[PDB]
Subunit: 142 residues, 4 copies
């Protein structure tokens, strides 16, 4: 049997880099800058989150499968997530907005923590599609 196909496919597949907002000044909102975490949304329906640790072994922090649900939401069927352990063996529904600039905004809701405490919190994330630049930088530290 087939999961529901009744959505307009979005360009979810890709390697995505987590971003954050950086300001030089205390009380002023920051501008978008890339960070150290990647989400691989594979062409064959698998999801992996992993984080670099400079000079050390990178680590997977979550993995599973994913499935688009509606024109602007998809689920991650998480097997294990060490960043967010209350999501283990559960579905997380992510609402998304993908811009032609390669920036994807995600948000998801979590009701309870692992100890059953009320949380009722929306999480918000900004991701940027990783691409191939025109030129191989001559001094790249591989």
């Amino acid at each position: 049997g087939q999961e529901s196909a009744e959505f307009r496919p979005a360009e979810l597949a890709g390697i995505w880099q987590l971003c954050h907002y950086v300001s030089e000044i205390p009380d002023v909102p920051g501008i978008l800058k890339p960070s150290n975490t990647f989400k691989v949304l594979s062409d064959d329906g698998r999801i992996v989150n992993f984080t670099m640790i400079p000079g050390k072994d990178a680590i997977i922090t979550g993995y599973g499968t994913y499935q688009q649900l509606t024109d602007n939401s998809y689920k991650e069927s998480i097997e294990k997530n060490i960043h967010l352990p209350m999501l283990d063996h559960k579905d997380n529904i992510l609402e998304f907005e993908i811009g032609d600039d390669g920036v994807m905004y995600l948000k998801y809701f979590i009701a309870k923590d692992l100890n059953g405490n009320e949380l009722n919190t929306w999480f918000h994330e900004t991701w940027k599609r990783v691409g191939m630049p025109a030129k191989f930088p001559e001094d790249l530290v591989r």
Copy 2:
């Protein structure tokens, strides 16, 4: 062939010593090879504080117990491999470290290169604990 567990995320490594003229010890670096279940390969390199970059992609397929092919579509690190097959010999240890070798005869301009390439890659895994101080 006996199917090897190639599919996964791999981190490039190098060897470091504090002194010259001695072998170094293995240390992870900034480049990743994503080998998907459906036979896609992507190499990308993190650049601290900047956008990561894809440096090659295509498809791949295991051929024998110690070799696989990358059918490269585009590779900006190794552009003589564009629309070519590269055959890689591989050995994967029980410690999750994979040693690759491959040979390239010519550069894109037809100059003789006749170079053997060696790469060490380590399988990226999920540790038991999320580190308290992690910079995501």
Copy 3:
């Protein structure tokens, strides 16, 4: 004036948030200001995996309880300050964080800039323990 403990090694900081339109929390970055006892100032920036670079130098002198001058010889980040004095207002907290402000009117080509600069710096210290996994 009451002499402030300016002499030392200072690390530039910035503010980070996971979401837009909110204030971020303080995080250290890659640039250092070395304020020597003999009144020399050097700014340099680490570039991961590459050679660090000096981006400015000169001399400095405390003027009042909350200001000091940098007499810049050369600054490739801020080249309108070459052979000029920059007056910085400073406040150093009990947590070792120093807040700097300064104002620059013109760029090197004479274009009006009239910009206030804010910098947050943190005093670099010696922790009680050398971390076991440190990458020197």
Copy 4:
């Protein structure tokens, strides 16, 4: 009173970056690459060693005063050294060679560890003088 001035002054003063040797291949010696540690040899006779920790607070690992002794040796009079605690409140004599290419080789001998165990080991280090490049890189992450 004055410490001995009977040496030909060398160009020790500077900010120095610790280097190591990197190879892509297991059993082959590496080439010189810069690492994350700095030694400030000040114009006014003070020494500080410190190490970056990417995304985190940098740390001082040793400090004191220094004094050239001979044409190719100097001492670090170490107050505290958390990298090498057997050097606390002691002099360490470093033999050096400074190249016109800005590379300095250092070596020093340590007899005993902090617990009094025999060590009798020569340490060897390679350092590179930090300089001001021609151009401010446009995309520098400060």
